[PDB]
């Protein structure tokens, strides 16, 4: 694992940043395969060292105001701690079936998952959610993020995908998780 090949280093690291921060967008195609198809996130967590947890933030430069809403809906997910319950249906409802067309549609997804409407609305307007929306926006700009998907380790190292083996699809996935596993151990 060398700098400039499998990963890179930021000329300005981010203090207080999560151990493993991922950036995605329910609108991005790459992001769809990054998880729904390839399942890169899960593979990473399978090789993640003890005590090390991952964090995923939704970006808002895609999909217009609806994206600005998905980012807030993503904050509700983290607030109530139901990330693993809404991720899949949101990815499908937006890109696959194409049912999710507004905040009203998103609300229905959370309800169908198990969250109550009043519980959703209360959270939707809570300060914890507000802190998260700004926290996510703050984090994105902090790493001078240009596009998604993208993963960062210890707020200093950025994952470099195309700088890794991409012949066999089943290998690229493992190599990525390993680089993360290696950078987390630093």
Contact 146, 130 (CB under 8 A): no
Measured distance between the N- and C-terminal CA atoms of the chain, rounded to whole angstroms: 12
Three-state DSSP state, 23: strand
Experimental method: X-ray
Nearest-CA neighbor of 21 among 168, 159, 132? 159
Q: State the residue range of the domain holding 74.
A: 1-186
How far is 91 from 184, CA to CA, in rounded Å? 28
93 forms bridges with which residues in the sheet?
A: none
Instruction: Count the domains in the chain.
Output: 1
Is beta strand 7-9 parallel, antiparallel or unpaired with respect to 157-159?
antiparallel
Domain of 36, CATH number, reads 3.40.30.10
Nearest-CA neighbor of 12 among 145, 125, 170, 120? 145
Three-state DSSP state, 169: helix
Q: Tell me which H or E stretch contains 157.
A: strand 157-159
Experimental structure resolution, Å: 2.7
56 forms bridges with which residues in the sheet?
A: 22
- Please tell me the number of Cα atoms within 13 Å of 176 on its side-chain side: 27
DSSP state string for 117-129 = HHHHHHHHTSHHH
22 forms bridges with which residues in the sheet?
A: 56, 151
Q: Rounded to an integer, what is the distance from CA 130 to the centroid of its chain?
A: 18
Nearest-CA neighbor of 22 among 5, 40, 36? 40
For the chain, the farthest-separated pair of C-alpha atoms sits apart, in whole angstroms, at 50
């Amino acid at each position: 694992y060398e700098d400039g090949k499998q990963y890179t280093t930021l000329e300005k690291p981010v203090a207080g940043a999560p151990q493993v921060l991922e950036f995605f967008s329910f609108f991005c195609p790459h992001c769809y395969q990054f998880e729904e198809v390839l399942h890169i996130s899960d593979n990473v967590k399978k090789k993640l060292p003890e005590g090390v947890k991952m964090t995923k933030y939704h970006v808002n430069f895609m999909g217009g105001d609806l994206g600005k809403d998905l980012t807030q809906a993503w904050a509700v997910a983290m607030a109530l701690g139901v990330e693993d319950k809404v991720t899949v249906p949101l990815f499908e409802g937006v890109q696959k079936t194409q049912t999710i067309r507004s905040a009203s549609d998103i609300r229905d997804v959370f309800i169908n998952a198990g969250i109550k409407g009043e519980e959703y609305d209360a959270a939707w307007n809570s300060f914890v959610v507000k802190s998260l929306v700004a926290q996510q926006e703050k984090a994105a700009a902090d790493v001078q993020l240009r596009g998604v998907p993208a993963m960062f380790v210890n707020g200093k190292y950025q994952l470099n995908p195309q700088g890794m083996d991409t012949s066999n699809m089943d290998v690229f996935v493992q190599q990525y998780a390993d680089t993360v596993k290696y950078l987390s151990e630093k």
